[PDB]
Each structure stands twice: as C-alpha cells, then as structure tokens.
Amino acid sequence: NSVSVDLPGSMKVLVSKSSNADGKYDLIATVDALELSGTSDKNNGSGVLEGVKADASKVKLTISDDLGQTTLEVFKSDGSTLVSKKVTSGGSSTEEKTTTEKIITRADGTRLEYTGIKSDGSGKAKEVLKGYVLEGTLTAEKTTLVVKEGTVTLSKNISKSGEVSVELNDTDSSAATKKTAAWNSGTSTLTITVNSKKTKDLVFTSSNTITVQQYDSNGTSLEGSAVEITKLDEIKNALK
C-alpha cells in the first residue's frame, strides 16, 4: 500500500500511495520512539507531522518540499514555546536546545550553581562553600556532589525537596581498609567504619559546613572535639 521515503537525518516517512477525498496524502513516521503523523498536498513525502510524547509537549517534524531538509521541532506542553530544534540538510545538521542556568545563593554566602540544565532536569552542579567547592551533577530526581579519594567516593545528595543525605562507597577489597558508612537523618551525621571499628563522624551542619570527629581506637565513643572542615583536602583526608 503505502510507499516509504528516506529523509535527511536517517529518518523515514511513510506516504500513502493514493490520495484521499480531500486531495491530500497521509504522512506517518516514528522519530526516536514516538509516532508522528499528518497530511500534505504532495506525494513525494514532504509536509508536516505532529505528535506528543509522555509529557504533553508537542513535536513537529517538517519535511521540506524537495526533501532536502528536515526540521524537527519540540515545544512545551502548550505547543507554544520551543525546547529543541534540529535542522538537517545535505549531510549537515544544526541542533538548538533551550537550556537553563540557576544560581541559588544562601543567607550565609554559600551557593549552589547549576549550568546546562536540559528539558530532562540534567545538568552540571556545584556547591560553592567556604574555602572549597563540591562539583557534581543533577538529574530530575536529585543533585549529587562527589568527592573521591583513592578507592572511596563520597556522594552528597540533595533531594528535590532540598533534603540532604550523604553516602560513601569504597570499592576496596581488603576488609582491613574498606570503608562503610551509615547516615542518620536525625543528626545530619555520617559514621564511617573500617575493619569493624568506627573511625569518623562527619557532621553536615545547618550552616552548610562539615565537622569531622574521630572515635577512639576501640571504635566505642568519640575523642577530642569536632574540627570544622576548611578545604577539600581535609575532606579527602577524612576519606582516607
């Protein structure tokens, strides 16, 4: 029945072999994983096609009359404002993406900077603190700032609600050095432990700072006083 026509950008349009009562042809396609359709006055496979993904957002693929160009536009749920736009023609493609950048500044001066936020909530993230910064990423579900030392990765997650939760992963094999950790929401504290004995309590203060306090060699209670971290190096040290 319907013919198939190849398009710039490695896409395929399906064009009805014969016209309907109105004198128009039915165009179908499937860009990525989403079905697009429409009608046109021409039989080669040129025209406009539309669709909607999981969200309300509207999608419009425009095949130019001579099949030399293809314009894939993606707007907001209202079908009004542009999110993405990809123009392909003669091997060359131009891709425009509307992104966003957000700088949250806190009462104490410490900031949270997101750059290159795309429509899916992804983007680079960075917490600028006092004397050091924590770089990381941001997805639609949480922000994760990372600090790695040797075989240990420290993840500070910030939920969409702004909730803070810390975890620590040690790929080390020797159970004499492997660090495990337990987070207590009720205290903003994370307790590390190497070889069946707790070693450090990392407290994340309401003042967007971190204190570190060592246990005794028996890993029973604490000793001395907590020292507030000032540079990234002290964090890494605590992670050793």
Instruction: Choose between 97 and 160: whose C-beta lies nearer to a second copy.
Output: 97
Q: Name the minimum Å distance from CB 96 to a second copy.
A: 5
- What lies within 8 Å, CB to CB, of 56 at 6+ separation is 77, 78
Q: How far apart are CA 159 and CA 157, in angstroms?
A: 6
Considering the complex, what minimum distance in angstroms separates the CB of residue 153 from a second copy? 27
State the minimum distance, in angstroms, from the CB of residue 88 to a second copy: 9
**What CA–CA distance (Å, rounded) separates 138 from 57?**
22
Smaller CB distance to a second copy: residue 99 or 187? 99
Nearer to a second copy, 24 or 85 (CB): 85
Closest Cα partner for 151 from 26, 239, 62, 32?
Answer: 239
**Pair 70, 59: CB distance under 8 Å:** no
Give me the least distance between CB of 40 and a second copy, in Å please. 27
| Least Å from the CB of residue 90 to a second copy | 7
First to last CA, the chain: 68
Nearer CB in complex with a second copy: 158/235: 158
In the complex with a second copy, the residue whose CB is nearer, 71 or 151, is 71
Of 117 and 232, which CB lies nearer to a second copy in the complex structure?
117
* Phi, psi dihedral angles at 239 (to 5 degrees): -80, -20
Q: Tokens representing 134?
A: 């924590």
Minimum distance, C-beta of residue 192 to a second copy, in the bound complex (Å): 31
CA distance 112 to 40: 49
Instruction: Identify the CA nearest to 68 among candidates 43, 85, 93, 51.
Output: 93
Q: Which residues bind a second copy (CB under 8 A)?
A: 81, 90-107, 115-116
